[PDB]
Amino acid sequence: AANLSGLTDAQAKEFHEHWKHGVWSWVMIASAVHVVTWIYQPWF
Amino acid sequence: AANLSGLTDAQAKEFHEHWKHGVWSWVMIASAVHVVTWIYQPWF
Amino acid sequence: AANLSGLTDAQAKEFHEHWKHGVWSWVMIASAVHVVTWIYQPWF
Amino acid sequence: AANLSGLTDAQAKEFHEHWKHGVWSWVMIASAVHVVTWIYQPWF
Amino acid sequence: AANLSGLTDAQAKEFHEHWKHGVWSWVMIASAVHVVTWIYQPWF
Amino acid sequence: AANLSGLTDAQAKEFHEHWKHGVWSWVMIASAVHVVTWIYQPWF
Amino acid sequence: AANLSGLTDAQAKEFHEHWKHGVWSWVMIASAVHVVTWIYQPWF
Amino acid sequence: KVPVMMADESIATINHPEDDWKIWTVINPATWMVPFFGILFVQMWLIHSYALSLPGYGFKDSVRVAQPA
Amino acid sequence: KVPVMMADESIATINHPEDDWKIWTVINPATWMVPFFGILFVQMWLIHSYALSLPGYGFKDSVRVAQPA
Amino acid sequence: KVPVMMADESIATINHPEDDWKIWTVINPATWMVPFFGILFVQMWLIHSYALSLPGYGFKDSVRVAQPA
Amino acid sequence: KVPVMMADESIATINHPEDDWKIWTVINPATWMVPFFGILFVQMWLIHSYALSLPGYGFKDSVRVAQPA
Amino acid sequence: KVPVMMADESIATINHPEDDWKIWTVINPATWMVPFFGILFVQMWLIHSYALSLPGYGFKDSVRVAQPA
Amino acid sequence: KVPVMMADESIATINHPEDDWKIWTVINPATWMVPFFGILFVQMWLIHSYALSLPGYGFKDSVRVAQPA
Amino acid sequence: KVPVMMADESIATINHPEDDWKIWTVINPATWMVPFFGILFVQMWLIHSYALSLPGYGFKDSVRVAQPA
Ligand code: BCL
Ligand code: BCL
Ligand code: BCL
Ligand SMILES: COC(C)(C)CCC(=O)/C(C)=C/C=C/C(C)=C/C=C/C(C)=C/C=C/C=C(C)/C=C/C=C(C)/C=C/c1ccc(C)c(C)c1C
Ligand SMILES: COC(C)(C)CCC(=O)/C(C)=C/C=C/C(C)=C/C=C/C(C)=C/C=C/C=C(C)/C=C/C=C(C)/C=C/c1ccc(C)c(C)c1C
Ligand SMILES: COC(C)(C)CCC(=O)/C(C)=C/C=C/C(C)=C/C=C/C(C)=C/C=C/C=C(C)/C=C/C=C(C)/C=C/c1ccc(C)c(C)c1C
Ligand SMILES: COC(C)(C)CCC(=O)/C(C)=C/C=C/C(C)=C/C=C/C(C)=C/C=C/C=C(C)/C=C/C=C(C)/C=C/c1ccc(C)c(C)c1C
Ligand SMILES: COC(C)(C)CCC(=O)/C(C)=C/C=C/C(C)=C/C=C/C(C)=C/C=C/C=C(C)/C=C/C=C(C)/C=C/c1ccc(C)c(C)c1C
Ligand SMILES: COC(C)(C)CCC(=O)/C(C)=C/C=C/C(C)=C/C=C/C(C)=C/C=C/C=C(C)/C=C/C=C(C)/C=C/c1ccc(C)c(C)c1C
Ligand SMILES: COC(C)(C)CCC(=O)/C(C)=C/C=C/C(C)=C/C=C/C(C)=C/C=C/C=C(C)/C=C/C=C(C)/C=C/c1ccc(C)c(C)c1C
Ligand SMILES: COC(C)(C)CCC(=O)/C(C)=C/C=C/C(C)=C/C=C/C(C)=C/C=C/C=C(C)/C=C/C=C(C)\C=C\c1ccc(C)c(C)c1C
Ligand SMILES: COC(C)(C)CCC(=O)/C(C)=C/C=C/C(C)=C/C=C/C(C)=C/C=C/C=C(C)/C=C/C=C(C)\C=C\c1ccc(C)c(C)c1C
Ligand SMILES: COC(C)(C)CCC(=O)/C(C)=C/C=C/C(C)=C/C=C/C(C)=C/C=C/C=C(C)/C=C/C=C(C)\C=C\c1ccc(C)c(C)c1C
């Protein structure tokens, strides 16, 4: 009903699918690099 | 009556519900992490 | 008469009421914290 | 004649009155504080 | 269907061709300079 | 012919007169202060 | 065909002429100053 | 609550904990609140620099302790 | 109050403590005042860096004192 | 999940892990999200400065080790 | 005053102390002047960092002097 | 490629290396990409500060070596 | 003056000291020139930090000299 | 020149030294290029800080040499 962003609910849900893809890709790659860094040196 | 933000009073109240949710979530998580940090080391 | 901010004089006065509230709240809380800090340590 | 700022000449002159007030207030208060600081310590 | 950027799908694909050109040029030049720097000094 | 800045050629020339005034005032005052600073200490 | 910048191809080419002038002037002056600096001190 | 305010004139009463939500009649959150989140991020970074500089916090003295890999 | 101002011409009288509220006829608070709050946040951070650097304030010398957990 | 929130009034239930996607009804990603990516870049730079300052990470002590060219 | 200016062409005379107010025909103060005030705030912070670093000014050497509480 | 994603619901498949170009349906490059180039410039400056601080790189120890003028 | 320029094609001649004023057909000074003045302010601050750091300039060694009050 | 590019599809050929000027069909120089000049100013300041820190350049060791006034 005239959302503040100017996006419809359908647009918002589709975008959120793409955003979740980006977030999870970033999280998984960061987790891999963290495991590798910890193997190299634990930092605690 | 043509609010400066361009939001109606109803829009403003609904948004404030969401904003209070965000604020309180942030406050509670920060409080938990503070309790844990203080247990680890009090800093005074 | 077509003010530069796009606000009417009535809007400007109402907003200034709210702004003065904010300013004075900030000033009074800062004054309290200053008194407490000075009691703890005067810094001159 | 369609000034670049979108202000008329009359608007510009009225604003400049207000701006000169601000500038001179700032200058005079700064001068007072400078005199006081110099009395305390000249810095040259 | 009224994309959020205001670009059509065809505009988006054409731009992406240009963007990939830029990205790959930057990557290849950086790779060359890295090889030269490593030859000069390996940094590990 | 619909210039990119939205200024006509006449507006552009008039503004450039004002801009040259500003530039030259700044240059001349800076030159004076530089001469005074060099007299005080040459810095090379 | 409704370029993304809002410039026509002719506007783009004319602007690029001006931009190339700016770029080359900057490059040539920088080269002169570099030659002078190297004469003064080579930095390698 | 209605706190006393330094040359308020009392046509508009404030009573604010209840009259929050009204800031959003001035601040449009579609244009702000990502900037405000950036402010919060800056605050986060600064308080972290400070806390990590305090003795015992963070990992400046604990890089190799135990359970290595 | 009406202070003397350096080449004012006196058609418009200023009298300002009363003629505040009039700044909001130039400054639209819907577009500003989150930026102004960001300025206030920067001021807050800078005065805090300064004060915390002063001897005795903050927690640089008090990390482990008493009542631990 | 529905967490308890400090003076919520319960006409609008939150339940948020499911009611994400709804932030994009306030935040237009065409105007944000490059700014948010800039925030992420700043975070990246700051965490890297910190980590590279920790002993053993990065290349401050390893510039010439072996396999040279 | 009319100062000599480096390749002015003299159709438009400047005479500026009188022809201030005319800058506001280019600079719209509703869009600027909060940014200009931010510039002034940055100037304020920088001159204060400098002055407080000078010996005797500020509170770096005076934290506990007298009249305590 | 289609990677597994943490509470995706599978009406829209991603397959992204092929479905790049689609970011430009959200990010208008006429308004961004000069800001993104500024981000890249900041990255360039930071990685250069770091690399130039590493021993042997840059010109901190080589200002006068040979072939002078 | 007409300087030689690296792959100019000569339909548009430049001759620029005369063809200044033409930059203002691209740069609208109502939207810029307060930002440009901010750039000039940053330049001013940086050159001042540098100059004040040079020996003899500024007030780092002259805080109490003579004619006190 | 046409360089090989990593998953280009060849409907649009690039040939770019000739097909510059085409960036200005995406980048509007009336809105950019003062920001780009600000980027260039930042680059200028950073390279100057670096160069002035190198031994022999600038005025850190030459404040009083000769020909004084
Ligand atoms: C180094 C020795 C002294 C010192 C010497 C000086 C000297 C010397 C001066 C100041 C001035 C100022 N000092 Mg100091 N000061 C010191 C320590 C402090 C401490 C502190 C935590 O210890 C504080 C809070 C301050 C605070 C301040 C500011 C109120 C003021 C600059 C404001 C300004 O220019 O706004 C610029 C205006 C703006 C950014 C826009 C408007 C913003 C708001 C509205 C400003 C409100 C207050 C202001 C005074 C109003 C001016 C009227 C105009 C109509 C806006 N000082 C040390 C101890 N201080 C300077 C000054 O200008 O005083 C006027 C000045 O000349
Ligand atoms: C290192 C030895 C000296 C020193 C050496 C120099 C030298 C050398 C120079 C200056 C110049 C300046 N110095 Mg210094 N200066 C020192 C210490 C100080 C101290 C201080 C707290 O001690 C202050 C307040 C200043 C202040 C200033 C500025 C007024 C001025 C730069 C303004 C400018 O470029 O605006 C740029 C313009 C803008 C950002 C836009 C307009 C902003 C407003 C309107 C400016 C108003 C004032 C200005 C003079 C007006 C110019 C006219 C134009 C029409 C705008 N100096 C030390 C002690 N100073 C420089 C200068 O340019 O003087 C003109 C200069 O050349
Ligand atoms: C380290 C040893 C030397 C040193 C070595 C060098 C070297 C090496 C170089 C410079 C260059 C520059 N030096 Mg230095 N320089 C030193 C000390 C100084 C001092 C000082 C206070 O002592 C000053 C004021 C300067 C000033 C300058 C600038 C004028 C110039 C960079 C401008 C630029 O790139 O704009 C970039 C353009 C913009 C940001 C946009 C336009 C802005 C305005 C219009 C620029 C006007 C002036 C400019 C020359 C015009 C170029 C033409 C184009 C059409 C815009 N140098 C020390 C002593 N200097 C560099 C240069 O590029 O010269 C051209 C360069 O190569
Ligand atoms: C600093 O450290 C110290 C100080 C030293 C130490 C302290 C320290 O470390 C701290 C405090 C750290 C704090 C960190 C925090 C809070 C991090 C928060 C991170 C978040 C929220 C990340 C979100 C990422 C989100 C991401 C990647 C999203 C990406 C989305 C993408 C690409 C979508 C594209 C797409 C692609 C195609 C198509 C067709 C479409 C439509 C889209 C949209
Ligand atoms: C620096 O330290 C030093 C200097 C070293 C030491 C000093 C120091 O430390 C200092 C001085 C610290 C000062 C700190 C201060 C003043 C902090 C102020 C904090 C505030 C005001 C936080 C507000 C948070 C607010 C929050 C999280 C709000 C979140 C809202 C959210 C997510 C809503 C989404 C949503 C979701 C879904 C839907 C559908 C909708 C519509 C919305 C809106
Ligand atoms: C850095 O330190 C050094 C360098 C180390 C040392 C030097 C140093 O320290 C210096 C120099 C310090 C200088 C400090 C200065 C000049 C400070 C100026 C402060 C000002 C002007 C504050 C204004 C605050 C104003 C405030 C809070 C206003 C708040 C308003 C609010 C919330 C209204 C909401 C609302 C709510 C509901 C509704 C319905 C509506 C409509 C509204 C509007
Ligand atoms: C950094 O230091 C170093 C680096 C360590 C040392 C070097 C250093 O120090 C240097 C170089 C310093 C250089 C300083 C310079 C150049 C300063 C220039 C200052 C200027 C131009 C100030 C202008 C102020 C202008 C002011 C206050 C104007 C205020 C106007 C106001 C409030 C109008 C409201 C209103 C009110 C009511 C109504 C109804 C209306 C309509 C209006 C408009
Ligand atoms: C900091 O270091 C530390 C902290 C010390 C150490 C840590 C450190 O290092 C770190 C963490 C680094 C992290 C780095 C990362 C994440 C880098 C990400 C880089 C990316 C995404 C680059 C994208 C480039 C993209 C590029 C060049 C694209 C260029 C496109 C161009 C020109 C198109 C024009 C055109 C031309 C003509 C025409 C006709 C058209 C239409 C167009 C569009
Ligand atoms: C940092 O230093 C190191 C790093 C330590 C050392 C290195 C260093 O130092 C370096 C590299 C320095 C480089 C410096 C450079 C490149 C400087 C470039 C300066 C320029 C381009 C200045 C232009 C000024 C232009 C000016 C003042 C123009 C003012 C115009 C004005 C007021 C018009 C008003 C008006 C008034 C009335 C009316 C009615 C109208 C219509 C108008 C428009
Ligand atoms: C930092 O250093 C370290 C970190 C210490 C060391 C590392 C370091 O150093 C590094 C990494 C440096 C990297 C540097 C790089 C990448 C530089 C890239 C530079 C570029 C792309 C410059 C472009 C300039 C472009 C220019 C001047 C263009 C000017 C155009 C102008 C005036 C047109 C006007 C006009 C005039 C009249 C009319 C009528 C019209 C229409 C126009 C348009
Ligand atoms: C917009 O949202 C964002 C910014 C985007 C983010 C979200 C956000 O804003 C959040 C989360 C906000 C949280 C806000 C809070 C927690 C706000 C808390 C406010 C409080 C606690 C105010 C207290 C005021 C007290 C007063 C005023 C006392 C006066 C006392 C005297 C004694 C007054 C004296 C006095 C009075 C009059 C006269 C005439 C005189 C002479 C005197 C002495
Ligand atoms: C928008 O997107 C961007 C920004 C552009 C980027 C993407 C982005 O946003 C991403 C990736 C986001 C990830 C978000 C996550 C991971 C969010 C996670 C949120 C969580 C975990 C919230 C938890 C809340 C817990 C509560 C609230 C507990 C309360 C407990 C008590 C005990 C409450 C007590 C209490 C309650 C009421 C009263 C009255 C009283 C007195 C008390 C004490
Ligand atoms: C827009 O353009 C700009 C920004 C303006 C500039 C240009 C730009 O963007 C450029 C140049 C971009 C280059 C991008 C690249 C190079 C992007 C590369 C992306 C990659 C490599 C993604 C990889 C993702 C991997 C995943 C997701 C793996 C998951 C694995 C598990 C095991 C997942 C586990 C899991 C899953 C589900 C559940 C439920 C659970 C429990 C688990 C554990």
Author numbering:
A (entry chain L), B (entry chain J), C (entry chain H), D (entry chain F), E (entry chain N), F (entry chain D), ...: 5 to 48
H (entry chain I), I (entry chain G), J (entry chain K), K (entry chain E), L (entry chain M), M (entry chain C), ...: 2 to 70
Quote the study that presented this structure, word for word.
In purple bacterial photosynthesis, light energy absorbed by light-harvesting 2 (LH2) complex is transferred via the LH1 complex to the reaction center complex, where it is trapped by the primary charge separation reactions. All such complexes are formed by the circular oligomerization of dimer building blocks consisting of pairs of low–molecular weight, hydrophobic apoproteins to which bacteriochlorophyll (BChl) and carotenoid (Car) molecules are noncovalently bound. We report the 2.4 Ångström resolution structure of the light-harvesting 2 (LH2) complex from Marichromatium (Mch.) purpuratum determined by cryogenic electron microscopy. The structure contains a heptameric ring that is unique among all known LH2 structures, explaining the unusual spectroscopic properties of this bacterial antenna complex.
Briefly, 17,338 electron cryomicrograph movies were collected, and 3.05 million particles were picked for data processing. Seven α-apoprotein α helices form an inner ring of 25.4 Å diameter and the seven β-apoprotein α helices form an outer ring of 55.0 Å diameter. The complete α-apoprotein can be traced in the structure apart from the N- and C-terminal amino acids, and the β-apoprotein can be fully traced apart from the first four N-terminal amino acids. Both apoproteins have a single membrane-spanning α helix, with their N termini on the cytoplasmic side of the complex and their C termini on the periplasmic side. Two of the BChl a molecules form a strongly interacting dimer with their Mg2+ atoms liganded by two His residues, α-His49 and β-His38. The third monomeric BChl a molecule is located on the cytoplasmic side of the complex; its Mg2+ atom is liganded to α-Asp21, and there is an H-bond between its C-31 carbonyl group and β-His25 from the β-apoprotein in the next heterodimer. The structure of the LH2 complex from Mch. purpuratum described here is the first direct observation of these two populations of different carotenoids, which serve structurally and spectroscopically distinct BChl a molecules, and it accounts for the spectroscopic properties of these pigments, which have lain unexplained for more than 24 years. The 3.6 Å distance is consistent with the rapid (<200 fs) energy transfer from Car1 to the nearest B828 pigment, and Car2 is precisely positioned, with a distance of 3.2 Å, to transfer its excitation energy to B800.
